[PDB]
């Protein structure tokens, strides 16, 4: 009935896209009024002829980022970090070093003034991400300037990670993604589910998987399946359903931190005044607000009433999450090739519109 309507709907925003760019697989869920769908297409294996399904295991690109913020807010609300700490409290080897001038805050959410969006190709080895943030210098001024960056949330990452005395994978495996009701979440993916794991795909079709890289889990290297993001989306659609410690980290990765433009930089989320139109969450995507600096401006009233959102890819898969607290609806897009983003953001837009009451 709605479950026929959503379908619909899905069928008609969503299921276009898989003949325009030759995807494989996807699942697509919505929540609204309190209830989840889950629709799926398509392969998660070509190969093997395996049907996408409510197992199906995905990369998740930069959504993982989330996933970094809340284990960061999580912390921070039991008292074991500050946001105003700096990293050398934590990884003691960079006390006094000039990287230890940055907050927790301002590495989250990319203004240390000085870090673009990879690590350099040379820097793999632990001894070598260490030795990179031994050697690291200020540029711009701390705090100023937003440049989206996988070295910046993922020193975050491995801070929060210290500071509760678990590798970060443990972190997210062990304490955030049962906190938040999640059962088939990885930053490694288990043995017995590895027939679960989709592969992704290029642009050839030929079958790819995310490879290792430096600080790669808090900045890109969580995998998940449809009904544990729909999971997170309820989550964050209710926290106050949830134990005191995750719901004070859920509140906390909502709130706004500065501003460029029309967008708010909230705790991996980004955060628009709602109702937004189109093309201001296709703006939050352009070229300049992800590959460039940009001069932040603090906030003087944060919008009061919000809706979130956040892509994520990696080489072989395509994520896109959104969520709007007033309407209490939210959807999930996975997909194991790369589709462009904007045409993540319409789609979804039309689908939520579609279901607003």
């Given at each position: 009935?709605?479950?026929?309507?959503?379908?619909?709907?899905?069928?008609?925003?969503?299921?276009?896209?898989?003949?325009?760019?030759?995807?494989?697989?996807?699942?697509?869920?919505?929540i609204?009024?309190?209830?989840?769908?889950?629709?799926?297409?398509?392969?998660?294996?070509?190969?093997?002829?395996?049907?996408?399904?409510?197992?199906?295991?995905?990369?998740?690109?930069?959504?993982?980022?989330?996933?970094?913020?809340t284990?960061?807010?999580?912390?921070?609300?039991?008292?074991?970090?500050?946001?105003?700490?700096?990293?050398?409290?934590?990884?003691?080897?960079?006390?006094?070093?000039?990287?230890?001038?940055?907050?927790?805050?301002?590495?989250?959410?990319?203004?240390?003034?000085?870090?673009?969006?990879?690590?350099?190709?040379?820097?793999?080895?632990?001894?070598?991400?260490?030795?990179?943030?031994?050697?690291?210098?200020?540029?711009?001024?701390?705090?100023?300037?937003?440049?989206?960056?996988?070295?910046?949330?993922?020193?975050?990452?491995?801070?929060?990670?210290?500071?509760?005395?678990?590798?970060?994978?443990?972190?997210?495996?062990?304490?955030?993604?049962?906190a938040l009701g999640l059962?088939?979440?990885?930053?490694?993916?288990?043995?017995?589910?590895?027939?679960?794991?989709?592969?992704?795909?290029?642009?050839?079709?030929?079958?790819?998987?995310?490879?290792?890289?430096?600080?790669?889990?808090?900045?890109?290297?969580?995998?998940?399946?449809?009904?544990?993001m729909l999971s997170f989306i309820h989550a964050n659609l209710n926290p106050q359903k949830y134990?005191?410690?995750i719901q004070?980290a859920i509140?906390?990765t909502?709130?706004?931190?500065?501003?460029?433009?029309?967008?708010?930089?909230?705790?991996?989320?980004?955060?628009?005044?709602?109702?937004?139109?189109?093309?201001?969450?296709?703006?939050?995507?352009?070229?300049?607000?992800?590959?460039?600096?940009?001069?932040?401006?603090?906030?003087?009233?944060?919008?009061?009433?919000?809706?979130?959102?956040?892509?994520?890819?990696?080489?072989?898969?395509?994520?896109?999450?959104?969520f709007?607290?007033?309407?209490?609806?939210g959807?999930?897009?996975?997909?194991?090739?790369?589709?462009?983003?904007?045409?993540?953001?319409?789609?979804?837009?039309?689908?939520?519109?579609?279901?607003?009451?």
């Open positions: 009935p709605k479950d026929q309507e959503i379908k619909k709907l899905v069928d008609q925003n969503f299921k276009p896209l898989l003949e325009k760019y030759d995807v494989p697989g996807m699942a697509v869920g919505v609204q009024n309190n209830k989840k769908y889950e629709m799926y297409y398509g392969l998660q294996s070509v190969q093997d002829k395996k049907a996408v399904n409510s197992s199906t295991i995905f990369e998740l690109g930069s959504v993982s980022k989330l996933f970094t913020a284990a960061g807010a999580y912390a921070k609300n039991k008292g074991k970090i500050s946001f105003d700490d700096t990293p050398g409290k934590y990884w003691k080897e960079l006390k006094n070093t000039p990287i230890d001038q940055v907050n927790l805050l301002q590495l989250a959410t990319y203004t240390s003034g000085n870090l673009a969006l990879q690590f350099p190709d040379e820097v793999q080895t632990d001894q070598q991400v260490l030795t990179f943030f031994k050697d690291w210098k200020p540029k711009n001024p701390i705090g100023e300037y937003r440049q989206y960056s996988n070295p910046s949330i993922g020193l975050f990452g491995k801070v929060v990670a210290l500071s509760m005395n678990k590798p970060f994978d443990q972190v997210l495996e062990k304490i955030i993604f049962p059962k088939h979440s990885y930053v490694n993916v288990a043995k017995t589910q590895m027939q679960n794991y989709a592969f992704g795909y290029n642009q050839e079709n030929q079958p790819i998987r995310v490879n290792p890289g430096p600080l790669d889990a808090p900045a890109y290297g969580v995998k998940s399946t449809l009904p544990d134990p005191a410690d004070r509140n906390e909502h709130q706004g931190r500065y501003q460029v433009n029309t967008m708010y930089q909230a705790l991996g989320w980004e955060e628009f005044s709602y109702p937004a139109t189109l093309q201001t969450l296709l703006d939050s995507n352009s070229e300049q607000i992800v590959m460039k600096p940009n001069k932040v401006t603090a906030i003087s009233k944060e919008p009061s009433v919000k809706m979130y959102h956040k892509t994520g890819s990696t080489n072989g898969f395509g994520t896109y999450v959104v709007i607290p007033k309407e209490n609806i959807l999930v897009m996975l997909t194991n090739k790369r589709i462009p983003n904007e045409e993540r953001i319409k789609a979804a837009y039309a689908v939520l519109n579609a279901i607003k009451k």
